[PDB]
Amino acid sequence: FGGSSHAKGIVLEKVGVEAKQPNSAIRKCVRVQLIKNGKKVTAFVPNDGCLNFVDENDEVLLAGFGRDIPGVRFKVVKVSGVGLLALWKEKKEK
């Protein structure tokens, strides 16, 4: 993940939706099937409200970080073409 800057992906399993803490990293991370690589990497959805928008099977664009689980490395930026922060705000539908 140094050749391209954004990678597409399939949301595979919302990992840890049964957690107790509302904005912990367990609830934030989501399992992702990378399309071109074929690997499965988990990525931080930046809110539990945004986790309510990240659905199953959907095409989801991810990016990196830069700086509760230090080591999960990617970041969900879009869900089905629409940006996830524009979904978090009431800007656009999907």
Partner: protein, 227 residues
């Protein structure tokens, strides 16, 4: 191809117009089974009202359009789906109603009226269908409330809460609470002032305090369905 169908009423026969189109929508057996549907409601961004639970709705799911009544409820810290009374503004709750079953990830639309006279944005709620079941497990907090009658140091005889020693004995080990954040335990039914009892607390409470029991009464959604 041609499709012949027996049993079509004289509303569609005697009121047919080619302006309104005709669908041939393909059900499955799952789409033919009634039951309870667990559903991820978000209100629409440009619906102006908020959506009460007991108020009926008109649904766009599958191939058909309902008028059934949901129960909005937040899976609040993932131990209970506690029953809300309104849809949260700008947030995804878990609605649940009685209709036909559909497979999950079925995104769906939601309406309060089929009337042209709505001055703005008829769409009520949008979302995805979460799962399906019968016999929901939606929970609403019932509080039983009462007044300190006599105040000793850690014990307190409290009143106006239970009606009888039978009810005290049913709740005779219960965690009772004072809104000062003061826990306590129902110990034993006080004999002659029937309905009052003895509790103990972690510290001394006041007569100004008010003593609550935070129980969780179960809620069944109503069935009624019509297209």
């Amino acid at each position: 191809a041609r499709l012949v169908i027996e049993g079509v009423p004289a509303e569609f026969c005697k009121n047919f117009q080619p302006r309104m189109p005709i669908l041939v929508g393909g059900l499955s057996a799952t789409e033919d089974r009634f039951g309870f549907v667990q559903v991820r409601i978000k209100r629409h961004r440009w619906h102006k009202k908020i959506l009460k639970t007991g108020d009926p709705l008109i649904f766009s799911l599958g191939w058909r359009r309902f008028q059934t009544l949901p129960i909005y409820s937040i899976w609040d810290n993932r131990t209970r789906n506690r029953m809300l009374k309104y849809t949260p503004e700008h947030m995804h709750c878990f609605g649940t109603f009685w209709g036909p079953l559909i497979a999950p990830n079925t995104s769906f639309c939601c309406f309060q009226s089929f009337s042209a006279s709505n001055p703005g944005f008829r769409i009520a709620a949008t979302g995805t269908v979460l799962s399906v079941d019968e016999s929901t497990e939606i929970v609403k907090k019932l509080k039983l409330v009462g007044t300190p009658w006599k105040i000793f140091k850690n014990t307190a005889f409290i009143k106006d809460m239970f009606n009888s020693s039978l009810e005290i004995a049913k709740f005779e080990g219960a965690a009772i609470r004072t809104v000062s954040g003061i826990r306590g335990q129902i110990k034993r039914a006080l004999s002659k002032p029937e309905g009052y009892f003895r509790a103990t607390f972690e510290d001394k409470i006041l007569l100004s305090d008010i003593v609550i029991l935070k129980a969780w009464y179960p809620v069944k959604p109503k069935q009624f369905y019509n297209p």
